[PDB]
Symmetry: C3
Amino acid sequence: EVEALEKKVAALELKVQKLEKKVEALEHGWDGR
Amino acid sequence: EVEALEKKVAALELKVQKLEKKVEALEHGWDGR
Amino acid sequence: EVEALEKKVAALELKVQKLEKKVEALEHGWDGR
């Protein structure tokens, strides 16, 4: 259970990281995004 | 504890999923979003 | 392990909360965002 939750949490951290990059790019207009 | 963390993680997965949909819609202009 | 996962999950909840605020601001044009 815990090891599977570690994996789910790691997947969430990657997804949140990607969302942060995308949202920052939208907010700041990076490269015209 | 673990069962409550499972629920928190599931809530995060739903919220991240919704954010991904919204951010993709913003990025791609889906339906004029 | 569990206590560390609680902390990671709490960090994710804060990050997702911030993303929701930013994405809602982008979607709704709040304050011209």
